[PDB]
Design a protein around this nucleic acid. Structure first.
Ligand SMILES: [Zn+2]
Ligand SMILES: [Zn+2]
Lengths: 109, 76, 83, 93, 85, 99, 148, 99, 82, 108, 94
DNA sequence: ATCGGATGTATATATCTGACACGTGCCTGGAGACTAGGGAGTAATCCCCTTGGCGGTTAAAACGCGGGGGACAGCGCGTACGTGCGTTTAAGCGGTGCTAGAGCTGTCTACGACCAATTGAGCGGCCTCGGCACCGGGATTCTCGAT
DNA sequence: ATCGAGAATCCCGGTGCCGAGGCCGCTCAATTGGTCGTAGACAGCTCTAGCACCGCTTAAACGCACGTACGCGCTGTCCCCCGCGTTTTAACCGCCAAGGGGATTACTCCCTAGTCTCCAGGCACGTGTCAGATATATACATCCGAT
């Protein structure tokens, strides 16, 4: 790069780079922290957040609302396949559950 | 008054000693009964070596007690 | 100021509603006692660790961070309360 | 008073970058903060362990890359690794 | 058939046995004596020098430390000694 | 003469309704009293932040909902529609919560 | 409290059956302070020497071992001149069943034969291990010049 | 004329004998070849240490034994004594392995 | 090149494993399902082991790599280091 | 306690206090390590090891043997209601399983 | 020769020679016990590190290890471990 | 196979309020330049051990057959649970008051990190003898067809 | 209820072997002693919110009656794993032989932590306004008894 702008803007990363570096340094993870690790980690975090936010926004739009709420977040996480596996242990507050009724319990013809 | 004294050889003997007797009086009685010289003798009771300058009255010794005798070999 | 028999405060309609959210159509009559026992055991497990966490820090009021840390320790991560 | 740090501005910027019209409430905002912190702790801890295994003492980029490969499932792992590689390449030059 | 008070005293406290407990090695000790030993001593039988940690853990949860037979015998033979303590 | 549904369908209606909402089904004060009783049984003279009580209630609700999901799965596997305590016991034993 | 009764029994049973070659009793008016006199075994180079030991009793007995110290300097691989003790039964293997008589007789037995397995002081143990005669001579002259 | 045991009275003997020993059950070379074939997809021309293959075999044996215990419990819960694929699937779903 | 090796897990081997598990009657369709789940488990463990080997710039799957992969998956193993 | 004796013998343990202290210091756990932490940790570790070994030896004596083998370790761990909970998610190689048979499968 | 690789073999053997004076232990069991000791040590130390970090501290004192032991072990084992460790530390300090 | 009630659910409109998005002051953490040194990359070498192959032998796997035990389907019973309604009970909301305790700030003092000399604990290598694996014969004990 | 034949399992004694335990040489890490910068223990102050109480709704819980449909026991059928005998296959053990790459050592260089200085990015606080919840009133999908 040109070594002119701020590090967060230098790498085109919305998430901060200095804060990640400080957290890695003072998090008791290793005696040394490389100069390239925080950029990579911030990029990964931003990409994950972007994916989750895109799915949640789609779910909210399909519900005729313009404000993301935890129910939409739970719908977005559960309906996907990869994000369901990644977050298979967490419990979203006020997230509800997916709608499903077992095929057996449905009324007979 | 009967009192038990036991040497380093494991022998215990009985001697009549009134409470008012001094330690040197007990040593003289020991000389009277066997005659083992008192210079090599040291008397032990209650973790304290008996001193001839104090009478047994102030030592607070009851009846049927047992004293220890240690011989100090002069030479070697 | 002690309390007694508060586990009966988890009334039968509440368990019915929880099951209906779970996806249950027909509920037997002996489910409620078993569910109350299970809930009591889970509460004991979480509260023990939360109280230990708040006792180590020499505090007197258990806080949300303590509860979420106990839940994370047991393997049930909780989002929406900090940390 | 005291100042407490959070990822509010960055997450909001990403949201406006992906959806120019939708907004986000407070509860979803705290949920996103918790998610970011949790993922950060997971990745950093795994990278620290992996660095310790090989008798190293520093966390370079490749430790984080391998930790990402270990943690995230397949398609997300590939996409995140590609994104991180692009970011580090852009940064270093 | 009936032990006397001379053999009924604690081997470490030299007092009438109060709330006896029986070790796996068939050794009887008073309850406060046992508690003091487990809290401060080397967690071994004073007489046999064998660890009782496994037995202690197994019997603590079910409250099986107590011995009903010896406790009843002592409390019936010498109620005055138990009451004065 | 009055119109009453055949037994079973309003249960399905309640299932459909309660799977869309996201409120807290258990009441607030009874749960608060229960958690206070357990805590005072652990350590006397304790105080609770309201956020702690809310977090505990949310965790318990999520755990119970998951347990009931697995219990229904077992009941359907046994060719029934009525969940019974043996199904809860089997689900817990398989999950490893009590062994 | 109970320690008072324990010490009363200990003094009583030491008095009725005094140990051979060892004499123990309380120097102070209080029961906690104690003194012991030990005379060397016949098959040893400690002939003609008597050693005094000071004993302090803890507030709790017999769960906590009583502290002991050498009043006179002793030349022995186990025993330093300063007065410290390196013995397993006193602290590591202490149990309530042990009595003061048992530990004193154990010390008397130790005085007969040095133990180089765990030497508190290395140079004296090495000198003793090198040859018995030099250690015997130095121990004899040491116990003659100091004890008497 | 030939002496034939009742069907189902020697399976219990096999259970008693196999629950008593500790040796490995699956054959060694088939497992090693299977491991090599599975591994060569991720990275080519790999090499293995015998200790690693032994550890993999032990872990797989323990996992399968546990899964079969769970399957037996699920099958018995349905008033049967025979395990079927649906029992394995139900046990795996309750454990949450395949989600 | 190697192919068609899942058949090495014979019917008697699965029967023996199930007998250790404590089952009495085994249906005829259990073997295929068992082979499938075993293949899935082997794939899952081998992926992590091979990635651990690749990071260290090595070319042999050491027992340590398998041990730490199993520990990561939640089924830690004793008896091969650790 | 008195000085001039090795650290492991100051508190009468058998596990190494110095090695535990070094492992805590150079293990990326915290910037500073207290002077009383390694002793306490070594005490806990030694207690747990002795607790395992006692039951293992009891099982070995039961099996008419004098050399402890992994099967004895598995028996000792699984037969104890509290050690089983602690080592719930571990696999001991060459260990086998506890002998059990469901009461339904037993013959009439 | 090779490098000096460390383990808890002699310490485990010394502990074994106290509970059972006349019972040896095989090599595989020795390795298993070594792995168990390492696992428990890492668990306790990691929990103590996290617990100290949560309170904005910088030292792993004895109290952090005590609370980590209390959290990790079940009831009776936790009580006995806490008692043993407290006795050991109070013997060491004086 | 519908047809008509009758119920509950879904849809359109006013409204109004509290939470969200934005602006402002500022201060603490991030950015830039410089220096020192240890961690890591790179090259070279050794030898451990991993792969490959050949031959024998035999425990193990594959195959086939008789059949008896179990899985599955259909029927009948009555008992437990669902559904609706009237009644009693305490949650929920508002408002107020008080103080125990969380949280912040200043002192300084004792605990812990760094550094150099050194010596004994613990690790690598050897060796041997006893516990255990194994074979062979015998006593003991479940098991089943037949009474 | 039992008797007895055939088969699997446990005991006991003798034989042999390999690996567990003890010993020796040694090299490096723990010990000891001293110094120095700072972490937190403590005392003091502030002020937040958690606890307690009181009054009024009305929403939820509770008890009850009636009906019906589902769990459970029973019976019958058929078909498919199981136990056992015979044959084919490759697992397993021992042996040899090569060289690939893991493990170690020596050298050099350059990346980063530490330090200081400077400044603006984001954090707490305050404010306006509109997105969504609520109430009211129609439109329509769906269930149930009966032809
Ligand atoms: Zn007593
Ligand atoms: Zn005993």
């Amino acid at each position: 790069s040109a070594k002119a702008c701020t590090r967060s803007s230098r790498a085109g990363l919305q998430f901060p780079v200095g804060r990640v570096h400080r957290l890695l340094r003072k998090g008791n993870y290793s005696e040394r922290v490389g100069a390239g690790a925080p950029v990579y980690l911030a990029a990964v975090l931003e990409y994950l957040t972007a994916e989750i936010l895109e799915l949640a926004g789609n779910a909210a739009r399909d519900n005729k609302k313009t404000r993301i709420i935890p129910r939409h977040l739970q719908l977005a996480i559960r309906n996907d396949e990869e994000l369901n596996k990644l977050l298979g242990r967490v419990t979203i507050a006020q997230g509800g559950v997916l709608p499903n009724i077992q095929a057996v319990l449905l009324p007979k013809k | 008054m009967q009192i038990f004294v036991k040497t380093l050889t494991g022998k215990t003997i009985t001697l009549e000693v009134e409470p008012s007797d001094t330690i040197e009086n007990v040593k003289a009685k020991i000389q009277d009964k066997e005659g083992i010289p008192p210079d090599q003798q040291r008397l032990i009771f209650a973790g304290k070596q008996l001193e001839d300058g104090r009478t047994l009255s102030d030592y607070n010794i009851q009846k049927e007690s047992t004293l220890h005798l240690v011989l100090r070999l002069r030479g070697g | 100021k002690v309390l007694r028999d508060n586990i009966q405060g988890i009334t039968k309609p509440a368990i019915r509603r929880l099951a209906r959210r779970g996806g249950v159509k027909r509920i037997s009559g002996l489910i409620y006692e078993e569910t109350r026992g299970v809930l009591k055991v889970f509460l004991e497990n979480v509260i023990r660790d939360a109280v230990t966490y708040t006792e180590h820090a020499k505090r007197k009021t258990v806080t949300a961070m303590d509860v979420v840390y106990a839940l994370k320790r047991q393997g049930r991560t909780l989002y929406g309360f900090g940390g | 008073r005291s100042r407490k740090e959070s990822y509010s501005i960055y997450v909001y910027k990403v949201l406006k970058q992906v959806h120019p019209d939708t907004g986000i409430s407070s509860k979803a905002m705290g949920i996103m903060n918790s998610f970011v912190n949790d993922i950060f702790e997971r990745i950093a801890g795994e990278a620290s362990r992996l660095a310790h295994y090989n008798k190293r003492s520093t966390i370079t980029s490749r430790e984080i890359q391998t930790a990402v490969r270990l943690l995230l499932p397949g398609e997300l792992a590939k996409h995140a690794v590609s994104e991180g590689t692009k970011a580090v390449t852009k940064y270093t030059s | 058939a009936i032990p006397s008070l001379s053999e009924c005293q604690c081997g470490i406290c030299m007092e009438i046995l109060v709330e006896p407990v029986t070790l796996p090695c068939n050794h009887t000790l008073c309850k406060p004596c046992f508690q003091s030993t487990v809290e401060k001593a080397s967690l071994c039988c004073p007489f046999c020098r064998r660890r009782v940690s496994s037995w202690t853990r197994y019997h603590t949860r079910r409250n099986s430390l107590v011995n009903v037979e010896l406790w009843t015998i002592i409390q019936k033979h010498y109620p005055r000694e138990c009451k004065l303590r | 003469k009055p119109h009453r549904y055949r037994p079973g369908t309003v249960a399905l209606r309640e299932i459909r309704r309660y799977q869309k909402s996201t409120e807290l089904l258990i009441r607030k004060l009874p749960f608060q009293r229960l958690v206070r009783e357990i805590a005072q049984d652990f350590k006397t003279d304790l105080r609770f932040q309201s956020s702690a009580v809310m977090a505990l209630q949310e965790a318990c609700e999520a755990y119970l909902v998951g347990l009931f999901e697995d219990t229904n799965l077992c009941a359907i596997h046994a060719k029934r529609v009525t969940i019974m305590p043996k199904d809860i016991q089997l689900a817990r034993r398989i999950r490893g919560e009590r062994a | 409290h109970m320690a008072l009764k324990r010490i009363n029994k200990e003094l009583s049973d030491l008095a009725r059956d005094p140990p051979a070659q060892i004499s123990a009793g309380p120097v102070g008016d209080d029961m906690f302070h104690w003194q012991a006199t030990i005379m060397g075994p016949n098959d040893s180079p400690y002939q003609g020497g008597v050693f005094f030991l000071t004993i302090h009793f803890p507030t709790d007995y017999p769960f906590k071992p009583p502290k002991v110290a050498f009043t006179t300097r002793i030349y022995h691989p186990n025993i330093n001149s300063n007065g410290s003790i390196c013995l397993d039964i006193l602290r590591s293997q202490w149990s309530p069943a042990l009595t003061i008589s048992k530990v004193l007789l154990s010390i008397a037995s130790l005085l007969d034969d040095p133990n180089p397995d765990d030497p508190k002081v290395p140079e004296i143990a090495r000198i003793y291990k090198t040859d018995r005669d030099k250690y015997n001579r130095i121990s004899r002259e040491w116990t003659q010049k100091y004890a008497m």
